[PDB]
Amino acid sequence: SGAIYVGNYRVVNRHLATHNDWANLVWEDSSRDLLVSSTTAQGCDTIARCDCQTGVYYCSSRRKHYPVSFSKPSLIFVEASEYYPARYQSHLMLAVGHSEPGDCGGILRCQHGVVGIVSTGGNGLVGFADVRDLLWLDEE
Numbered sequence: 001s002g003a004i005y006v007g008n009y010r011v012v013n014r015h016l017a018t019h020n021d022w023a024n025l026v027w028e029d030s031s032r033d034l035l036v037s038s039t040t041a042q043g044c045d046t047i048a049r050c051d052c053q054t055g056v057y058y059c060s061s062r063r064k065h066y067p068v069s070f071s072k073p074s075l076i077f078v079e080a081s082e083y084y085p086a087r088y089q090s091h092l093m094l095a096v097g098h099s100e101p102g103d104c105g106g107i108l109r110c111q112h113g114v115v116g117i118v119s120t121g122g123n124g125l126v127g128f129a130d131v132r133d134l135l136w137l138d139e140e
């Protein structure tokens with residue numbers, strides 16, 4: 001589990017979104033596994049605005065933050081998981097590392113802020129849903 005709290009936005013994995021998230025929906029995209037809902041309280045996370053390919057992610061199933069290199073956001077074929085069939089997922093970045101379903105929502109961060117959240121795992125790879133192209137999170 002996990003979210004990003006920026007401004008009056010909460011960013012979560014679409015497959016972990018709550019009723020309250022859908023009841024306060026701003027934007028959602030199944031192909032990216034993302035959903036954004038509106039918040040009453042201001043959040044303090046900063047979204048990275050950059051093309052970094054190195055950062056650090058939180059892996060809840062190891063209680064550890066791991067430094068990783070990660071790929072550029074792309075349309076990636078993902079094997080079936082407990083929460084999606086095998087499919088193409090868009091705006092996804094891969095690293096070599098551990099990720100199980102409970103790790104979804106863990107933050108990937110670089111020197112500029114939050115890059116994205118864990119979304120995929122298996123075959124020794126971890127996949128992150130990028131948020132750096134969602135420039136509207138920074139405003140309004």
Ligand SMILES: [Zn+2]
Nearest residue numbers: 050052110112
């Ligand atoms: Zn960066």
